[PDB]
Amino acid sequence: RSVARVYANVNEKLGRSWWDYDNLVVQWGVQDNYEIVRKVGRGKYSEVFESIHLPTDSKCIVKVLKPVKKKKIKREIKILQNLAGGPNVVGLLDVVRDSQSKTPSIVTEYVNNTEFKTLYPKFSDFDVRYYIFELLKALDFCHSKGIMHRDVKPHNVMIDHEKRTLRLIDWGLAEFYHPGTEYNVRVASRYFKGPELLVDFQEYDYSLDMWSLGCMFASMIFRKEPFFHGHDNADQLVKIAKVLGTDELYTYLERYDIDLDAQFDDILGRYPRKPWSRFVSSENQRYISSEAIDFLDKLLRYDHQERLTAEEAKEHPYFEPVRQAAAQAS
Ligand SMILES: Nc1ncnc2c1ncn2[C@@H]1O[C@H](COP(=O)(O)OP(=O)(O)NP(=O)(O)O)[C@@H](O)[C@H]1O
Numbered sequence: 436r437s438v439a440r441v442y443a444n445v446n447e448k449l450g451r452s453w454w455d456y457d458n459l460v461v462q463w464g465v466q467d468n469y470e471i472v473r474k475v476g477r478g479k480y481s482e483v484f485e486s487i488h489l490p491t492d493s494k495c496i497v498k499v500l501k502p503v504k505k506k507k508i509k510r511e512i513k514i515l516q517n518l519a520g521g522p523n524v525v526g527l528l529d530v531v532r533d534s535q536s537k538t539p540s541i542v543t544e545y546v547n548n549t550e551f552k553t554l555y556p557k558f559s560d561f562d563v564r565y566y567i568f569e570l571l572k573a574l575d576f577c578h579s580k581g582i583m584h585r586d587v588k589p590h591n592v593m594i595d596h597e598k599r600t601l602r603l604i605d606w607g608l609a610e611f612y613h614p615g616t617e618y619n620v621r622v623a624s625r626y627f628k629g630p631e632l633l634v635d636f637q638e639y640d641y642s643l644d645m646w647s648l649g650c651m652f653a654s655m656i657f658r659k660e661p662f663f664h665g666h667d668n669a670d671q672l673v674k675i676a677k678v679l680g681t682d683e684l685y686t687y688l689e690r691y692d693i694d695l696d697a698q699f700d701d702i703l704g705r706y707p708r709k710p711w712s713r714f715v716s717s718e719n720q721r722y723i724s725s726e727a728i729d730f731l732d733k734l735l736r737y738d739h740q741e742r743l744t745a746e747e748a749k750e751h752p753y754f755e756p757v758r759q760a761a762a763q764a765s
């Protein structure tokens with residue numbers, strides 16, 4: 436059904452030691468070396484707190500995991516250990532657990548983050564090109580290591596704007612890419628789910644992350660959050676269809692031999708492609724460029740195989756200002 440355009444063989448080249456997270460022995464740190472200070476975040480399967488590594492008296496983040504299954508915890512630790520030292524990936528400090536209840540926690544570095552609703556409007560056209568390019572660097576890295584984030588979204592992209600640093604967090608939905616594996620379609624957030632998730636296509640790959648990157652980016656440059664605002668998973672496909680059109684939806688379904696569920700014929704309707712230029716307004720005009728639109732259009736495609744790769748996106752003309760600045764700076 437589907438094999439990824441790039442990095443399909445990475446898990447085969449790296450060993451079983453690289454992806455067999457079931458057989459992982461965790462060298463737990465000392466729970467009592469960490470003191471929890473204040474709650475800074477929460478998730479469906481987690482609670483997050485700013486904390487102190489007491490021996491060093493240094494700030495960090497402790498994420499208390501509620502296990503869906505023990506195996507899921509091994510996957511997240513395995514992936515963080517594997518991605519260590521990679522550009523703009525959140526740094527893993529420790530894994531610990533309570534001795535009595537055996538509840539685990541992950542200790543990562545603290546990032547001084549501004550809420551995206553507050554931070555995104557403050558950005559210039561250059562900032563967006565720079566921060567999206569920094570995010571590409573992570574996506575490319577972890578894709579090149581045979582890993583899919585599967586929850587790329589603003590909430591899992593911490594940015595310190597004074598430092599001009601970016602870290603991708605929340606690897607709890609990250610899974611290893613094995614060619615032809617049916618993966619679970621109940622991944623990502625509603626507004627960043629890819630068309631493949633919405634139609635229950637299971638043989639997806641690292642391109643899922645690029646569609647979501649495009650939802651994110653479209654949100655920044657059009658100043659609309661979220662860009663695709665479906666009320667449920669069915670409405671989410673309808674909202675995507677009203678922009679991309681259903682002429683290209685049907686050839687994509689036909690191309691991938693997906694029969695749509697019967698619920699959709701009642702609500703899907705018939706829609707023409709809405710051009711990207713109709714989303715341009717006075718408020719979001721600063722972000723708008725002909726490079727930005729072209730770049731967005733090569734992310735937001737029904738067919739995952741037509742999406743730009745993270746490596747390909749970096750060479751896009753939209754980022755050339757970012758590349759030029761970095762070359763001249765050094
Ligand atoms: N390194 C960090 N620095 C600063 N804040 C962080 C850091 N890691 C996590 N947070 C905050 O904690 C929140 C929740 O973290 P996250 O790991 O996404 O939790 P979760 O339980 O997996 N939530 P969800 O994404 O909904 O599945 C984030 O949205 C951040 O605001």
Ligand SMILES: [Mg+2]
Nearest residue numbers: 478605607608
């Ligand atoms: Mg999670």
